[PDB]
Curated annotation (Swiss-Prot), chain A:
Subunit structure: Component of the CSN complex, composed of COPS1/GPS1, COPS2, COPS3, COPS4, COPS5, COPS6, COPS7 (COPS7A or COPS7B), COPS8 and COPS9 isoform 1. In the complex, it probably interacts directly with COPS1, COPS4, COPS5, COPS6 and COPS7 (COPS7A or COPS7B). Specifically interacts with the ligand binding domain of the thyroid receptor (TR). Does not require the presence of thyroid hormone for its interaction. Interacts with CUL1 and CUL2. Interacts with IRF8/ICSBP1 and with nuclear receptors NR2F1 and NR0B1. Interacts with NIF3L1.
Domain of life assignment: Eukaryota
Gene assigned in the entry: COPS2
Subcellular localization, as worded in the UniProt entry: Cytoplasm; Nucleus
Protein name, as recorded: COP9 signalosome complex subunit 2
Signal peptide: none
Role noted for this protein: Essential component of the COP9 signalosome complex (CSN), a complex involved in various cellular and developmental processes. The CSN complex is an essential regulator of the ubiquitin (Ubl) conjugation pathway by mediating the deneddylation of the cullin subunits of SCF-type E3 ligase complexes, leading to decrease the Ubl ligase activity of SCF-type complexes such as SCF, CSA or DDB2. The complex is also involved in phosphorylation of p53/TP53, c-jun/JUN, IkappaBalpha/NFKBIA, ITPK1 and IRF8/ICSBP, possibly via its association with CK2 and PKD kinases.
Organism: Homo sapiens
Post-translational modification: Phosphorylated by CK2 and PKD kinases.
Family according to the record: Belongs to the CSN2 family.
Curated annotation (Swiss-Prot), chain B:
Name the record gives this protein: COP9 signalosome complex subunit 1
Function: Essential component of the COP9 signalosome complex (CSN), a complex involved in various cellular and developmental processes. The CSN complex is an essential regulator of the ubiquitin (Ubl) conjugation pathway by mediating the deneddylation of the cullin subunits of SCF-type E3 ligase complexes, leading to decrease the Ubl ligase activity of SCF-type complexes such as SCF, CSA or DDB2. The complex is also involved in phosphorylation of p53/TP53, c-jun/JUN, IkappaBalpha/NFKBIA, ITPK1 and IRF8/ICSBP, possibly via its association with CK2 and PKD kinases.
UniProt-listed GO biological process terms: JNK cascade; protein deneddylation; protein neddylation; regulation of protein neddylation
Domain PCI residues, every copy: 211-373
Recorded family membership: Belongs to the CSN1 family.
InterPro entries linked: CSN1_C, PCI_dom, Rpn7/CSN1, Rpn7_N, WH_DNA-bd_sf
Keyword terms, alphabetized: Cytoplasm, Nucleus, Phosphoprotein, Signalosome
Domain free text: The PCI domain is necessary and sufficient for the interactions with other CSN subunits of the complex. Mediates the interaction with CAPN8.
Entry GO MF terms: GTPase inhibitor activity
Organism whose genome encodes this protein: Homo sapiens
UniProtKB/Swiss-Prot annotation, chain C:
Phylogenetic lineage: Eukaryota, Metazoa, Chordata, Craniata, Vertebrata
Oligomeric and partner information: Component of the CSN complex, composed of COPS1/GPS1, COPS2, COPS3, COPS4, COPS5, COPS6, COPS7 (COPS7A or COPS7B), COPS8 and COPS9 isoform 1. In the complex, it probably interacts directly with COPS1, COPS4, COPS8 and COPS9 isoform 1. Interacts with CK2 and PKD. Interacts with the translation initiation factor EIF3S6 and IKBKG. Interacts with ERCC6.
Assigned keywords, A-Z: Acetylation, Cytoplasm, Nucleus, Phosphoprotein, Signalosome
Gene: COPS3
CC terms in the record's Gene Ontology section: COP9 signalosome; cytoplasm; cytosol; nucleoplasm; nucleus; perinuclear region of cytoplasm
Name assigned to this protein: COP9 signalosome complex subunit 3
First and last residues shown, out of full length: 142 to 406 of 423
Length: 55, 409, 265
């Protein structure tokens, strides 16, 4: 399992304490949150430029 | 410390000339009960090979450690100077004959004497003039060989970087279209191999191995140059530290060109294979034993500490990558340390490094922490709004203090 | 405003001056001439002291910054003791000295800074977490910190170092013994660390629970998910501040357009 996971062949992780393998039935349409993160980052940089234009 | 796998036959047959002395001159002198035997072999070679300045510079220390022919070195100094002047007059005759064909070998031959004599500072300036007298592509091929080898021998890295870039663009972008898919001789193999040694000194390990792995074993064994033994070690250790699993498989594990170098160095081959196969206790243990051997090197010694730390960090991240919760007792045994020492190493990797986990010190279990994407965006967006409003109010007051023209006079 | 803040600062009645410090000044009264920069700096310095006394470091830092950024050509006594307090307040609220605005006067970068060298050294020590070393510096330069009357604001920097280190343990640990916790933060005792964590939970600077049976502290670090109606009202309140702030920006912009001087160029 370790070799497959490190090779990106199996999408999951191993719970060594309980001897479990939790798969990756995840990664839904969460591209909205990443889009909002880019919007916030651009606004943070743009705001600083406007104030520091001349003085 | 014992070296049973290193026989003296392989040690002496790797290097040639006086470049061996500068290897064991200072670092190999910090280990007692080991230099004394090597001094017996050093007493047979250091007198020969045209040594004049180094004859007295280094032997003054070993003299007090304890008849001989003290007058033997006196005669050598005077005779050497006379030989250089005799052949200069003959060369000038060809130049005055207006024969451009015969003068071609004159500049190439005169620069050769500089290397063997010992004085190399004048060779670099002489080679600058020879560049002007090179208009054909055939002439460019010859003078490129000399300039590369002499630059390293003086250890001027600032000038090496500025000068090596010229060799890239000068020869019409690698001989037009490559001259019908490269020549029979792999000259480009030697070009990159010399560059590989320079890049390691520049503290760029990834580019050093990247430009060292494509070496073709067609040269087999070259006694006139550096041994292939340290080439595998330099490439392998830089391969383990900087490239990831995908690049390691593509360039070392499955690349059927560098494996030949791994044959003459079996120890490094076991290092990379065991690291790839997620066997860390064996990979790190035999790496630790090899550290003492590499510490006597002149080139890898200033990089042993940095490379080893990088390798161990990669092992820790790669060990925890497939897990969502990993017991610390199994992890401690696999890393040759104790649970207490493992905790202190992982805290540094969680505070800043690539590991995203939370150590549970009660049951000694390393749980993996996954950030919540939705909450992270809300926290950052609200923080940006708070910062933006503060900047707006401060600017608003700045407008008032600018209109009123207020200053401290 | 400077006089009122100064009067309530000498005789300590900070509450009456709050309504005149919670509003954002946008205009400066010309007062038929006069009104030198001394009055402007006094308001944004005595206001900083007032907020500092009430342990409101978020707005106290803002007030000191405005005084520093005032255009100037010479060092003043009322501006010298505002770079000094800017560092101390930033060390208490934030983890380090905040970066000054790019349009600050050049007098602070060339003349004010060299006099304030005990506070700059304090910031240097307050970059690698070591309370023992910072304790020595405080007792070494103690004569300077007590002459400027900003004593008791450096002792809070001592406490803030311990609380910052505990706030850093939440970035790496999930359950830590009290005995083990009082070994990296140099609290020297599980009993001492027990009350330090308890105080921080009540303030809200950390999310943790103390298990006295095993002598452990579990770091929850799960404050709230953004699915609340209270959070919806919180975002709306931040909305109204920005919406109404933009309206006053538009109003002052329009008066520029109808200015007879503006139309010519």
């Amino acid at each position: 399992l370790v070799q497959c996971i490190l090779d990106n062949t199996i999408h999951g992780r191993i719970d060594q304490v309980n001897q479990l393998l939790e798969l990756d039935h995840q990664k839904r349409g969460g591209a909205r949150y990443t889009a909002l993160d880019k919007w916030t980052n651009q606004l943070n940089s743009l705001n600083q430029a406007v104030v520091s234009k001349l003085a | 410390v014992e070296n049973p796998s290193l026989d003296l036959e392989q040690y002496a047959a790797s290097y040639s000339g006086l470049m061996r002395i500068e290897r064991l001159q200072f670092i190999a002198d910090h280990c007692p009960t080991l230099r004394v035997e090597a001094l017996k072999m050093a007493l047979s070679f250091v007198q020969r090979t045209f040594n004049v300045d180094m004859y007295e510079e280094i032997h003054r220390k070993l003299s007090e450690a304890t008849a001989l022919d003290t007058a033997w070195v006196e005669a050598t100094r005077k005779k050497a100077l006379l030989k250089l002047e005799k052949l200069d007059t003959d060369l000038k005759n060809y130049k005055g004959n207006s024969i451009k064909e015969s003068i071609r070998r004159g500049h190439d031959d005169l620069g050769d004497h500089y290397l063997d004599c010992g004085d190399l500072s004048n060779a670099l300036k002489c080679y600058s003039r020879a560049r002007d007298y090179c208009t054909s592509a055939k002439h460019v091929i010859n003078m490129c060989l000399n300039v590369i080898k002499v630059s390293v021998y003086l250890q001027n890295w600032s000038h090496v970087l500025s000068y090596v870039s010229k060799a890239e663009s000068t020869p019409e972008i690698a001989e037009q279209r490559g001259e019908r898919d490269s020549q029979t001789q792999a000259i480009l193999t030697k070009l990159k191999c010399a560059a590989g040694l320079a890049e390691l000194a520049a503290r760029k390990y990834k580019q050093a191995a990247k430009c060292l792995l494509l070496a073709s074993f067609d040269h087999c064994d070259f006694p006139e140059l550096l041994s292939p033994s340290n080439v595998a070690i330099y490439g392998g250790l830089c391969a383990l530290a900087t490239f990831d699993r995908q690049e390691l498989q593509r360039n070392v594990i499955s690349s059927s060109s560098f494996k030949l170098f791994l044959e003459l160095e079996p120890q490094v081959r076991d290092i990379i294979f065991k690291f790839y196969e997620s066997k860390y206790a064996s990979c790190l243990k035999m790496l630790d034993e090899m550290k003492d051997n590499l510490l006597l090197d002149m080139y890898l010694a200033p990089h042993v500490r940095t490379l080893y730390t990088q390798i161990r960090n990669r092992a820790l991240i790669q060990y925890f990558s497939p897990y969502v919760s990993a017991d610390m007792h199994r992890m401690a045994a696999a890393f040759n340390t104790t649970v207490a020492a493992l905790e202190d190493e992982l805290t540094q990797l969680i505070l800043e490094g690539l590991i995203s986990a939370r150590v549970d010190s009660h049951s000694k279990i390393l749980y993996a922490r996954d950030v919540d994407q939705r909450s992270t965006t809300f926290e950052k967006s609200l923080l940006m709004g708070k910062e933006f409003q503060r900047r707006a109010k401060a600017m608003m007051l700045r407008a008032a203090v600018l209109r009123n023209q207020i200053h401290v006079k | 405003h400077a006089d009122l803040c100064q009067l309530c600062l000498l005789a300590k009645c900070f509450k009456p001056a709050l309504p005149y410090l919670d509003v954002d000044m946008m205009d400066i009264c010309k007062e038929n001439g006069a009104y030198d920069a001394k009055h402007f700096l006094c308001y944004y310095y005595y206001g900083g002291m007032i907020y500092t006394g009430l342990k409101n470091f978020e707005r106290a830092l803002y007030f000191y910054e405005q005084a520093i950024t005032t255009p100037a050509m010479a060092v003043s006594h009322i501006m010298l003791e505002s770079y000094k307090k800017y560092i101390l307040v930033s060390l208490i609220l934030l983890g380090k000295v905040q970066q000054l605005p790019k349009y600050t006067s050049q007098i602070v970068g060339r003349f004010i800074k060299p006099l304030s060298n005990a506070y700059h050294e304090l910031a240097q020590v307050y970059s690698t977490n070591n309370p023992s070393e910072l304790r020595n510096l405080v007792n070494k330069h103690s004569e300077t910190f007590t002459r400027d009357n900003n004593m008791g604001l450096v002792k809070q920097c001592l406490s803030s170092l311990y609380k910052k280190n505990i706030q850093r343990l939440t970035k790496t640990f999930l359950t830590l013994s009290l005995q083990d916790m009082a070994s990296r933060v140099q609290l020297s005792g599980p009993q001492e660390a027990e009350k330090y964590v308890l105080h921080m939970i009540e303030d809200g600077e950390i999310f943790a629970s103390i298990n006295q049976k095993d002598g452990m502290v579990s770091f929850h670090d799960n404050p709230e998910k953004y699915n609340n109606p209270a959070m919806l009202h919180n975002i709306d309140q931040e909305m109204l501040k920005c919406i109404e702030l933009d309206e006053r920006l538009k109003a002052m912009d329009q008066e520029i357009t109808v200015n007879p001087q503006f139309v010519q160029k």
